[PDB]
Amino acid sequence: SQIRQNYSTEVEAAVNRLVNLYLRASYTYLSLGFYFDRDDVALEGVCHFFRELAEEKREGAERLLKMQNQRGGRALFQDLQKPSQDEWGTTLDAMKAAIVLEKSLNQALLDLHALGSAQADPHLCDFLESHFLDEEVKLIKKMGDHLTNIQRLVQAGLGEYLFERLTL
Amino acid sequence: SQIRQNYSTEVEAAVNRLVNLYLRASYTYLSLGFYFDRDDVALEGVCHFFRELAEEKREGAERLLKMQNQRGGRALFQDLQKPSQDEWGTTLDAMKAAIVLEKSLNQALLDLHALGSAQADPHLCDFLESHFLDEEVKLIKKMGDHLTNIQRLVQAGLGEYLFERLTL
Amino acid sequence: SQIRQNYSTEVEAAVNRLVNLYLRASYTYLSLGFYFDRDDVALEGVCHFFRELAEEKREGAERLLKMQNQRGGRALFQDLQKPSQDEWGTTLDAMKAAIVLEKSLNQALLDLHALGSAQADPHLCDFLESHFLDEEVKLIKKMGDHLTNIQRLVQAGLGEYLFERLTL
Amino acid sequence: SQIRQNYSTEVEAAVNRLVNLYLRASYTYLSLGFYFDRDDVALEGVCHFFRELAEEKREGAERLLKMQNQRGGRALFQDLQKPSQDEWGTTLDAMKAAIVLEKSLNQALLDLHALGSAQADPHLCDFLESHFLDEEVKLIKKMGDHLTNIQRLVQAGLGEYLFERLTL
């Protein structure tokens, strides 16, 4: 690329992999959202929580793709693997799966940051710090807070209803 | 001091001690606030309740220091002892500790008022009555009300969640 | 902690130490502020300057404590040592002591940043850069500017009055 | 009086004496104000400072007289002695004389409060605390602050001009 400068092939590939991870996460959240919209699950606050996260993860992927082009790298897309479950159990189960997912995304961000540091790519490092790393820490703290409240509420049906009504 | 009039060395020293007590109380409330912000505690209403009290106690100390200077006394600061606990247990435990703390502050105010009366210092007496004594009585009544509601709510997890959601 | 990820015990402890340093600095500024409010000192602009700094340092400590919880670390508080002086001398003396204090806080921030870099903790590194490092550089530049103006003004009483009236 | 209740002849007389003291103080401040308005003195800020105090002391006297009537006592007026000086010297001299005057008024208030306490007259005690004692403490602190600034400014002519321009 005529514009490419200080942008390694290793980072370019890792960015494409991270796009795939963010799109997969968006897909997982889409599935979580619609599961909580089932008439036999019917927790609207939980559905809304996960639909908003599907939106956030898609936006993350789009920001990465914008950055790939800004740097002169080439976006390459792969299949998006279907989510790991078809049914997501209770709100507690779902929130546990969400924190597992976010910790994996965070680890991928940290790995990419390490790669950028190793490659002396400060634009990449700053981009991640500015748009992704703090967003992830805040979201994981919020999920942990939710998990703690859900756990203290387990008369499990009553507790699940109250959390959806009064927290979400 | 060129302005000092009817202001005993005994009152001046007791005011400095009371500043220290109010700052210690602010510090204790700071610790309480952040404990309830822990991801494994996660009671935001409780965190907010104690953070607002940390602010109130600091403001109290500052008012005392302003008064010390208005009277021509000299502020003298001492170390602030760390709070008595590192972890504060349940909301019930915390509210019990808060009422113990406020009763101690109130007793110190009453002791200082008695000293002012003994020293025939009506400005001091009025200052305490106007800015501190009623504030303390109101706060202790509110804490007692909270303690009673928390106690009636002990399915203890459920009760702790509902109090934070519906009262705080 | 269920949320803790890439957050070393070394950083967690250093953050707690830095909270203590920021709270100690707030306390020092509280003492400076009230000294300049003494009827026999009576430099209101100087009092206001240091009271605003006491507020800034407390806010810094609170931001650190918020971050400690976001990362899944545990806040631990220690005694707050009383300020190093009971009386602070002239505005020049006070401003010299303030720059010494800020340079110490800045060094602690730089030490913690180095630790974060060594531990490959980019969230910590970014947090400090974003909220603390530039704030410190700006404040130290402002103090240095003030020190230079105070020094050029030493008829020392006249100079002290004019600085408080026309700069602060 | 048909309305008089718990109001001793001793307090009634002391209130009349205190009215006289407040009116005398107003007169003294009137003289101070106009001295600083002399073409060969010409310190407008100082003139304004003392004219506002003449107003405050007259208002104090009127509040006392209103209270005397509310309690069923009988106002009795005496001659108002002319102020102690015809010419008031420098701003420093004047501010020294003003603090002497206010300390005397404050002592009279404290004496009357003691008398009210001895006579078990809480309405009197509260009236003084609410309308006079804190006003006096604040005014004496302000005068002490002014005296300190005037003293640090003594090139005495230059210092007198700057204080009037930049403080008053």
Ligand SMILES: CC(C)c1ccccc1O
């Ligand atoms: C003394 C001030 C700075 C303080 C210390 C600790 C906790 C809260 C405070 O306001």
Ligand SMILES: CC(C)c1ccccc1O
């Ligand atoms: C007593 C009133 C009329 C009075 C006299 C002298 C100076 C000021 C005053 O308000």
